[PDB]
Amino acid sequence: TTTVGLVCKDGVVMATEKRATMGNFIASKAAKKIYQIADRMAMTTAGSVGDAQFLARIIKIEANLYEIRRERKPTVRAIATLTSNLLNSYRYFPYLVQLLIGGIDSEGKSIYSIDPIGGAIEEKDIVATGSGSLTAYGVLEDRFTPEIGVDEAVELAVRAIYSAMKRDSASGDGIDVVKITEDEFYQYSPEEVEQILAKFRK
Amino acid sequence: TTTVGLVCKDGVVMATEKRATMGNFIASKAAKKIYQIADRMAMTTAGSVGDAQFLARIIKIEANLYEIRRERKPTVRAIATLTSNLLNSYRYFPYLVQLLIGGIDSEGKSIYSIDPIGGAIEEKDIVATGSGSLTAYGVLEDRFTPEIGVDEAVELAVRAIYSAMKRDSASGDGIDVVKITEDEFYQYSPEEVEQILAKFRK
Amino acid sequence: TTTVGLVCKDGVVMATEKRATMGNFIASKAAKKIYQIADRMAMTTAGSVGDAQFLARIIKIEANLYEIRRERKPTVRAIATLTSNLLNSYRYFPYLVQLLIGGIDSEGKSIYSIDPIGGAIEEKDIVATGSGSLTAYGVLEDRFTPEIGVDEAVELAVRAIYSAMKRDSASGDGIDVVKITEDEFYQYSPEEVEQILAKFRK
Amino acid sequence: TTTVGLVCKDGVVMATEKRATMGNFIASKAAKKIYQIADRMAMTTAGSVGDAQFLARIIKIEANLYEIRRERKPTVRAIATLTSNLLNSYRYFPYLVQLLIGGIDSEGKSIYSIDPIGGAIEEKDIVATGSGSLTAYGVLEDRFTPEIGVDEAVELAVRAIYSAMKRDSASGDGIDVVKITEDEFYQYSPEEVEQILAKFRK
Amino acid sequence: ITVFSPDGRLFQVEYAREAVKRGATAIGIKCKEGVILIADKRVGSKLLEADTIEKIYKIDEHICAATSGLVADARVLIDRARIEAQINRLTYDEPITVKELAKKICDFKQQYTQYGGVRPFGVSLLIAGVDEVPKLYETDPSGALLEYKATAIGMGRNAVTEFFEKEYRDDLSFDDAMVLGLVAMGLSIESELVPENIEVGYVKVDDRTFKEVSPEELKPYVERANERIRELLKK
Amino acid sequence: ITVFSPDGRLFQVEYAREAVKRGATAIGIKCKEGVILIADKRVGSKLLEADTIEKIYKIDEHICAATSGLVADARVLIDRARIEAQINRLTYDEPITVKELAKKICDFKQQYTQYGGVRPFGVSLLIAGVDEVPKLYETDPSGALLEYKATAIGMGRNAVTEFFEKEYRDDLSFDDAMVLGLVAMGLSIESELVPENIEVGYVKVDDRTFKEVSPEELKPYVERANERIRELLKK
Amino acid sequence: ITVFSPDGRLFQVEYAREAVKRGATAIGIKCKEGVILIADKRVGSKLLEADTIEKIYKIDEHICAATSGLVADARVLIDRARIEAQINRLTYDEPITVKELAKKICDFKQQYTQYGGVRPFGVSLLIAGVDEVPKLYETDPSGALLEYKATAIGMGRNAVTEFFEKEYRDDLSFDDAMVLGLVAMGLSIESELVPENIEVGYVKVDDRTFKEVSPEELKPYVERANERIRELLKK
Amino acid sequence: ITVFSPDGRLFQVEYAREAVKRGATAIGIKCKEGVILIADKRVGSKLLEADTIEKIYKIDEHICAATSGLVADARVLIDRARIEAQINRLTYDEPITVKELAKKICDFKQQYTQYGGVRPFGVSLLIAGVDEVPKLYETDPSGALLEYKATAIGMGRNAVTEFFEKEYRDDLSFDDAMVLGLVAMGLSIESELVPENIEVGYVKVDDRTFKEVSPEELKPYVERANERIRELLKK
Amino acid sequence: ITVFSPDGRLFQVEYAREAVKRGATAIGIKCKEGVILIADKRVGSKLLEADTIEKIYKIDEHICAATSGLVADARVLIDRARIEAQINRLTYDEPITVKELAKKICDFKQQYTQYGGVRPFGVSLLIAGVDEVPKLYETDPSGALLEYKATAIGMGRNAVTEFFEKEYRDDLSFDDAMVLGLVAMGLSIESELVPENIEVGYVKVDDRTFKEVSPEELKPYVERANERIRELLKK
Q1: Which of A23, E52, E143, G86 makes the best surface tag, with the fewest CB within 10 Å?
Q2: Signal peptide: which range, if any (chains E, F, G, H, I)?
Q3: Inter-chain contact B57–E61, Cβ cutoff 8 Å?
């Protein structure tokens, strides 16, 4: 459990682990925990895995629903605030997940962190939930400067969750990353990320 | 987690601790536990962060709705009361917060504290609410006088909050302040506040 | 709480202890746990006097109603099953009172033991309930025959019940007994029974 | 409690102890624990005694109704599957009872066990169930042939329940037994079963 | 109640539309520089207070609507627009588009027309705002939606709409567009206007916030618009 | 029940207005110094104890309302109006305005006009109070909200309004206004009044409290009015 | 069911009033020293028992009611009144006053007017009591509630009201109010009463409780009235 | 509302079918490389903006559906299609097929025809889409569903269906197929098209994503079409 | 409203029956080797995609029904019959019998003519299958089921039945049965058959699996039937 997210001057990069365990039994290690909600808009999730993917599907269906219906793709803001409202209505039922929905929209770049009882907080800045987060956000803040490429942003996010990986293997050992550039929506998958961590040894 | 709020002779100035934690861990750079409800009304929350956010949004929507329907701008009492009856209707899905809603209307200046158990009480010119409040009352009330400028008051608010922050090992950094002067609803935000508290050192 | 119930060749007799085990507390001494449901049909209870008396009122009424509506005297099985459905419906409302409903009809004679969790067991000759169930039954077993007279059954029943009834001294004064012989729904009353069991001593 | 059920070349034979306790006390041994569902079909319960009684009446009433509605007797599987759905319908107030419902139809013979929380499995030849399963299955597996005849099976089926009920502290008070030979639906009764063990160690 | 006619029209929608027709005219004139939304106060006598009559209701904070028809039906549909407009801010944290709100209040009209336990509204609304470009809508009792660049509802509808086929232009100067809509209003009533027996609001492009013409500001526009109104009722 | 005509008017609304015509007259006269409300009890028989009869109903501490139409409809609407005024106080801790109280119950009337389950409330209510400045509204069966400043509902509407059309000045000290309103009532019924067969309430500017004017206190006004009433009915 | 006609009257309510007139009269006379409520329980057949049949039903201990119109409709309303008077004692631990009770069952009748799947109760009730001072009421099937000094419902309404218009006085001796009341009853039927076919109950001030005037104690009043019942038919 | 006719039809369906004839023609051409759906947004005034009025709606990411009949019903019916589509996608992670999408919205029209609580939706839709092969449906206001290769609903149905019977192939390639449906549209309105008076969408096979034809991209096809429309019309 | 005729018939049901007659003819024929079911894919234009018109629905793995009457109703009844069939499966883990499937949808159909709030079905189905002997049922719009040894519904109702009275031998083989039905169908529409204006499906006994005869295997049975259809339309 860690999510990191950073808002560059050339796009948006988010990262997450692939591995979250309940007990010593491994619930996933092949699940993506970054989902793509709308064309160039992602959702990243810290908490349990299960609720994260089921929830991302509803928010995706609703995002597609906003696009088709209103004749205009939804803002990052629109979908974050719509997830927040849903979470809050849904506090009788298991959707206690702390999510970072972010992307690009007509207003530029943003990532919102979404409180698990619903309640968005706008960031033009950087964020981590999780239990890997404590270390990662520290390392994240050290080499982040507001003049930053997404070329190096992917490196940094990998680096940050590598720090989280030292604690337990629960975080890291599989890591997803996304780069979003408003004309590319690239989800690296293990193999490529393995080479960006092959410059960091492990 | 404390809020102070003070009615000045020509406005309202109130402040909170920006400090928002999960453990003791700082997830984002900003998490404003101060909301603008109406054009010259605030809502400061001492207690939970996420529950506050969503709840503020409701009240805020209703303050706008009020204005549009009645062709009259809400008074401080109106929003403040509206919130009490709201909390009480919605105790089935309780928000565990001690708010302070105050600011400025045609009628003049006032700040009300609102329970989730309900009831909006009015505080004459000083109020402190939170775990840090007992410490806050101390600093606030020595140097508060019934005649105090808005400018003299901002110095006092930051000071009243600051006394708590050094005391806790789960606080230290972050400040909210809003001077509401009857022309402006200025939200000073971290940078500007910082030079206010580089006159009281550490 | 001891109940006996036995099907003769020529009568049906059942007995109970006057009050249940309530602790050292007592309320009245015109309390009874033996009620008349239909003309020649009784209900004896193991459990609370209050729970037994209320439910008995509902059953007596439905029995009376059955009788009227189909111009046929209800048979004991008809009431025992009727009472089975009331209990199963009310298994999450407090009626853990466990009933022996027996007496006399056109189809013959029985005693049916009816449970909070439903069904009805036709007891073909000897039946007890309670905490005094094992003690009281053993006394019965001893002199029971399928040819026992109505009075011998009365003499048997009072001795048998009196043995388990030794356990409580704030219920060993008074005894419930009933004769069902198709001509008498006789309920003896304390005084007339008491000279019988002077001989088995107080 | 212990059940068996034997599938045969000439029938279905099933057996269970007749211990039926209410509270935890044996009121009387004037009970059954084999209930007749259809013309040539039985239900034997392992689990709590209370649940089994009323539940037999319901399953049964539905089976005479199916015979009436469809002009054709139900199959072994139809009743067993119904009992599965029946259990799952009232699972807000659940009945915890493991019913072995089996008997005879045109398709041949079979015994289906149904679990209180879900589906109905077929048991190929041999089925047993209860806290006495472990011994009772132990008798079966060292003497069962698949060319086992109906009278032979009654002797084997008794021996399984006999051996099992001695060991447990929750099982005894005679053996109930049933032969379903599609010419008779014979229930051996206390009288007869007692003689099959009096060829043993009584 | 609501059933199809042998023409395949709704008897009750056509009757609802005539209901609009005996209302009181409104008018909306659009430009690239804002959208002007004007509605005619009813003054029948001098006992009618005429400083506190609603004819231009503000719905959301950059979307206003004017009305004609049954003022009772209309307010309730307007209150409903205001709740829907704020429900958008609650669930998406962004104001409703001028189109988006328009559809949503017409769902409300359309549901009533179809159910036989209730009758359609006998109101038409003009909903005008700026979501990022000026918009002006006209909704019909059926719940039909038509974007427009100039429009009128009410009694003056026919007069004004015909009028806009000559005068209206695609781009206009806001000060021009404002005056052109007072001229139209003047024409339809068949008399000079007085600043306090007409209502005017506007969403401008620069403000993106509904504002409403105070009587004094209005004053010069009535005066310039009176000269052309005079020319027209001579020819 | 309620459907539109080929002429666009809801038959039920139009007929509810005939009920209002068929009712005992009230009246509102608002000046700068506060707002008065006068209602005719009449006659009765001489067995009617018509000095206990309400027709002026206090809704809120600073609001009263009068009525004409169906008595039954009137009373029920007034009980909802009173509930509404206190519900505002429950939820916003501030008294309801005169407009929002009048508005809320007109929305409630509009609910009973569109639904075919019910027939309309056949009542006109005058809502008068001083909430932030004297305001006197008149409500109509449909929920037509119109603000007046001197008005009449009931059997006396045609007469009393023509009276107010020449005579109403906006200036008026409170006494000149009460005498004005009383004269108007007198012309309708075509005779001199009895202060016991009329009931006068008022909400004042200076008190901002409702008081109902008892026959003792009303006495000097009546005397100065019966003078004028007799005079004008000889012209 | 219930619809307005162009004459502004709910036709079903006007038909209910005709139902009242076809019922058996009751009458109430009010004095300073209590209120008396007399009702005709007169039977048409010999086999019909006139020793038990109510036309004066006790509501609360301070309140009584009489009735005219459809006995079935009445009996449901009166049972409602009995419950309603008792609901007051639950929640405020005081006895309901006469106005609030009559008003409450009237608010109930008014609902059944305006509810489209159910029809107006066809009944007028005379609710008499002494809550502090004497009160007498007449309700109507409309929901109309009017306080009267002396009145009738039913057959006798036109005759008896008229009769009171001359003979009733504002104050009377209880004993005189009683004879006057029974005279009015005899004039209406145009025959002499017997005690065995009228019911007279009251609520007195001094007692503050309801008692019912036993046939033995009815007797002397009926004989005293008999002389005048003839006198007025020889006039 | 809806019941059988003595001729074994349903009145409300038949009059609804007439509602479609009284609408604005639309029209679909299915070829092997896509399905093209062109609708007539040909306007009634010059102040009706013909560049922000919509009559071809996207329903999913490979389905678009055009409409004729009543505007209001259509919008709502299609909104139901958009939710039903996405609901499918939610439950099965597979995008809803044209046929099956059409079946659920036909069930919905059928519910409103079936049941006596509500009147039918008076619209015909053409649902166009490539599920995995190009599919073109016609939906009728009863809830009937028919697969066509080329079809029309609305005003132009008579002209357009007759035209395809005289010119249409199935080895018709995409460009020629676009011109066919634009030519056919021209015949409906008995004039040459204008690119601002029609909206065109197509789900292609190769893309398998709906993309709308631009006003820019309309122009090559309008030019070609016009040579063939003029030739036919001037004969 | 569905009420009684003074002839003991339901009218809505008689009217529904004519809707069944005016529908698209199907037809089932049973032999002791399985049961066939043929339904005419009806085409009015060359622009119907006729290969995709469903007129024989599969309902379980051994049950199929074709239909005649109103197409909208027909589907929902069939969608109903599909869930119902499966529900039997879900609770008893048997297949539903063909008779019981027919009962259960006919019990549904009855509700729709029991309640006067909603309209009847106007669809008849031919539900054919193999429970454990072949079956064929004709359901009625009342909701009543009759077992037929070979029958039709629709416009061929009398033509097909008449034919079967003479031709039907009982005691038939499948290949004969196949052709026999085809003749009966070709005579319904009174012309010669092509395989692509009929859809044909069957449940064999010796497999108990449903199959739809693709036009490839269909063509040989047609060819034999075109000889007999010709013979008969030339006598």
Answers
A1: A23
A2: none
A3: no
Kindly report the number of other CB atoms within 10 A of residue G185's CB atom.
25
What contacts F98, CB < 8 A, 6 or more positions away?
F63, F127, F128, F129, F131, F135, F136, F137
List, as ranges, residues 136-175 from E with C-beta within 8 Å of B.
none
- Please pick, among B1, B45, B81, B83, the residue that the annotation labels catalytic: B1
User: How many CB pairs below 8 Å do chains D and I form together?
Assistant: 17
Looking at residue C147, the DSSP 8-state letter turns out to be: T
Distance CA A164, CA A135 (A): 6
Q: Nearest chain E Cα to H51, which residue?
A: E147
CA-nearest of D99, D140, D185, D115 to D7 is D140
- How far is it, in rounded angstroms, from Cα H167 to Cα I229? 33
Q: Are D87 and D116 in contact (CB under 8 A)?
A: yes
Other residues' Cβ atoms within 10 Å of the Cβ of residue B68? 21
Name all domains of chain B by residue range, CATH numbers in brackets. Answer: 1-202 (3.60.20.10)
Neighbouring-strand partners of residue C101: C43, C112
Q: Report the C-alpha gap between B94 and A91 in whole angstroms.
A: 11
**Residues within 8 A of B (CB atoms), A 30-89 only:** 84-85, 88
User: Do residue I91 and residue D81 have CB atoms under 8 angstroms apart?
Assistant: yes
E142 contacts on H by Cβ (under 8 Å): 70-72
CA distance C116 to C87: 5
What is the span of the domain harbouring residue G175?
1-235
Determination technique for this entry: cryo-EM
Cβ contacts (< 8 Å) between A113 and chain B: which residues?
Answer: 27-28
The phi, psi pair for E6, rounded to 5°, reads -70, -10
H/E segment holding residue G64: strand G63-69
Cβ atoms of residues H40 and H197 within 8 Å? yes
Residues E20, E22, E25: CA angle, nearest 5 degrees: 75
What's the domain count of chain H? 1
Query: Which H or E run contains F78?
Result: helix F71-92
Q: Distance from H1 to chain I by nearest Cα, in Å? A: 9
Measured CA to CA in angstroms, residue F90 lies from A63, B82, F84, F93 at distances of 40, 9, 10, 6
In this structure, are residues A76 and A113 in contact, taking their beta carbons and an 8 Å threshold? no
Residue F92 to residue B77, Cβ atoms within 8 A: yes
CB contact under 8 A, H76 and E107: yes
Q: Which amino acid is present at C89?
A: S
Position D154: which residue type?
A: V
Residue C24's Cα: distance from chain center in Å?
24
Give the one of E1, E17, E54 whose C-beta lies nearest to F116's C-beta.
E1
- For testing contact with chain B, the best of E52, E90, E101 (most B CBs within 10 A): E90
Q: Which residues contact D90 (CB under 8 A, 6 or more apart)?
A: none
Phi, psi dihedral angles at I155 (to 5 degrees): -85, -20
User: What token pair was written down for E184?
Assistant: 């139209």
In DSSP terms, which residues pair with G148 in a beta bridge?
F48
> Taken in order G164, G167, G170, G172, is the CA torsion positive or negative?
negative
| A125·B27 Cβ contact <8 A | no
B/e letters for E88-107, b = 16+ CB within 10 Å, e = fewer, are bbbebbebbbbbbbbbbbbe
Residue G167 buriedness (CB in 10 A; 0-12 / 13-18 / 19+): middle
E209 to chain H, closest Cα gap in Å = 23
CATH code at G72? 3.60.20.10
What is the rounded CA–CA span in Å between residue F113 and residue C40?
64
Q: What is the largest CA-CA distance in chain C?
A: 48
D77: which chain I residues are within 8 Å (Cβ-Cβ)?
A: 92-94
